[PDB]
Amino acid sequence: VETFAFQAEIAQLMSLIINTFYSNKEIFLRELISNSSDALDKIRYESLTDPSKLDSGKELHINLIPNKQDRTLTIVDTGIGMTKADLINNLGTIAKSGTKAFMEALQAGADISMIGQFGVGFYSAYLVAEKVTVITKHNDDVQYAWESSAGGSFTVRTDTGEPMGRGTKVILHLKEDQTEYLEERRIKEIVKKHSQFIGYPITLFVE
Ligand SMILES: CC1(C)CNc2cc(O)c(C(=O)N3Cc4ccccc4C3)cc21
């Protein structure tokens, strides 16, 4: 288990997201789906000239899995996935150019929905989740598990769970008062409202 500190302003942004009430929390789902769509675009374009890229699975899709028993909302895609370096670099350690400006915008009264435009939309997951687990599988690399309950740090380890083929799975352990995101019609309506033009199938697993 390797522990990493978040870059100074990303940690500050996570603290702001967790400790300030924002009304429009539902946008976390749009942000997560948009990352899945970009990872799906990446593998799709690479596969055009190299069919071996899809040896790990040909279907390009997004699955949404609410689980009321464990209080988790899981977002699974079959995108390009992340290597160990992609995970540590892109999920917290390296500075994002828009972090400082986004924190100043929020302080000046900007809506939380603006997050994606500043390139830090992943962190909107902390609007609804007390803990976030990201399992990822990239071609020619092993399966990794990234995890953080915020507080300034995250962990990376080799994943020993169920193999995923290729892609990324985001497991959101929802805050006690954020259980509306486990309801089938509430998930369906946030998808129609914010992610209707995403070019990939988005399937909801009704429990
Ligand atoms: C964790 C989070 C940022 C939120 N949710 C996801 C979902 C993901 O599939 C991925 C992912 O695997 N990648 C790799 C890649 C390559 C090019 C462009 C974008 C991305 C994001 C990442 C994320």
How many angstroms does the end-to-end distance come to? 33 Å
Largest sheet: 8 strands, mixed
Q: Could you tell me the number of beta strands?
A: 8
Strand content: 15-25%
Q: What is the chains' assembly state? A: monomer
Order of helices and strands: EHHEEHHEEEEHE
- The CATH architecture can be named as 2-Layer Sandwich
The share of residues in helices is: 25-40%
Strand order in space, largest sheet: 1-6-5-4-7-3-2-8
The coarse silhouette is globular
Separate helix tally: 5
Say which CATH homologous superfamily is assigned.
Histidine kinase-like ATPase, C-terminal domain
Overall structural domain count: 1
Alpha-carbon Rg, integer: 16 Å
CATH topology, what is it called? Heat Shock Protein 90
- The CATH class label is Alpha Beta
Question: What small molecules does the structure contain?
Answer: ligand L81
SSE class? alpha+beta
PDB class: chaperone
Keywords: chaperone
Assembly: monomeric
Entry title: Structure of HSP90 with small molecule inhibitor bound
